């Protein structure tokens, strides 16, 4: 019985994903987040081991949930007449990367490096579990302010990872690659890498580089902030127009700009604690 | 501007 085992707090936000509430697990006071998804609003369905029809999001989160991660954990879920309810881990204190960037502006390279590294580890983890996120962006990342750990959220636009072409997409347009914009086709990994380049530009410049289809298609990158040459190079590499000209995760992580990353806690101590 | 999507 959903109502008895959780105590609802205030609405955290709402949007394409539905509505997310702060909550608490009554039994042990574990901070949780409670997400409501309307059935009519779910485009993509999957099925479990047992075979009953759930949101793809549930399948995906189950595939990435075992062990530890920079992926937010699914603790439980419930079906209701017209909606599904997902219980998810909630770090405390926490701020999403979008608000963090809004508040602090362009991030120091050292901080952006630590953050970007953790995103990369989390995305490799997903891929390793056969899950493609398809909506990587600052709004979909949480910062545990005490430990300096990033967590990936919102798998609601995700898919099973495959090696063949995708011809459907419902993530964020401004993070989507030119091959999507032009042809409505992309491969999972190289599209993920493009959005990672958008993300990295966002972190080091305080905003995304493209707002328009024309700019995405053109793929010319201009810097408004002082940014090192190695960082600019990594960015322009991730944003190569041809998918096969983009780096693999391995190449990204071996890039000279990615050397000497801080540990999460070091990151929180240097950049996050007051 | 610096905005949500
Ligand atoms: N503008 C908002 C819109 C709501 C969005 N959603 C959100 N926010 C979450 N946590 C959260 C908790 C307190 C405060 C915030 C904050 F400040 F909105 F970033 C986020 C969680 C979560 O802790 N676990 C799983 C999902 C989740 N989702 C975070 C950013």
Residue numbers in the entry:
A (entry chain A): 33 to 306
B (entry chain B): 3 to 7
Give verbatim excerpts from the published study on this entry.
Human Pim1 kinase is a serine/threonine protein kinase that belongs to the calcium/calmodulin-regulated kinases (CAMK) group. In contrast to other protein kinases, Pim1 kinase is constitutively active, and its activity is primarily regulated through protein expression and stability rather than posttranslational modification, although regulation by phosphorylation has been reported. Pim1 has a typical serine/threonine kinase fold comprising two domains [N-terminal domain (NTD), residues 33–120; C-terminal domain (CTD), residues 129–305], which are linked by a hinge region with a unique LERPXPX motif and the gatekeeper residue (Leu120). The ATP binding pocket is between the NTD and CTD, and it is surrounded by the hinge region, glycine-rich loop (G-loop, residues 46–54), and activation loop (A-loop, residues 191–202).
Here, we report a crystal structure for Pim1 in complex with a newly developed inhibitor (SKI-O-068). Our inhibitor (SKI-O-068) exhibits a 133 nM half maximum inhibitory concentration (IC50) and a unique binding mode with the Pim1 kinase. For the inhibitor-bound structure, electron density was clearly observed at the ATP binding pocket and assigned as the SKI-O-068 inhibitor. In the SKI-O-068-bound structure, the trifluoromethyl phenyl moiety of SKI-O-068 was recognized by Leu44 (NTD), Val126 (Hinge region), Asp128 (CTD), and Leu174 (CTD). The SKI-O-068 cyclohexanamine moiety interacts hydrophobically with Gly45 (NTD), Leu174 (CTD), and Ile185 (CTD). The SKI-O-068 pyrido[4,3-d]pyrimidin-5(6H)-one moiety forms a direct hydrogen bond with the Glu121 carbonyl moiety (hinge region), and it forms hydrophobic interactions with Val52 (NTD, G-loop), Ala65 (NTD), Ile104 (NTD), Leu120 (NTD), Leu174 (CTD), and Ile185 (CTD). Superimposition of the SKI-O-068-bound structure and two AMPPNP-bound structures shows that the SKI-O-068 cyclohexanamine moiety is positioned similarly to the AMPPNP ribose moiety, and the SKI-O-068 pyrido[4,3-d]pyrimidin-5(6H)-one moiety is superimposed with the AMPPNP adenosine moiety. Moreover, SKI-O-068 directly interacts with Asp128, which is similar to certain ATP-mimetic inhibitor binding modes. Although a synthetic peptide was not added during protein purification and crystallization, additional election density was observed at the substrate-binding site for the inhibitor-bound structure, which is not a water molecule. Thus, we tentatively modeled five residues from pimtide (3KRRRH7) to the additional election density at the substrate-binding site.
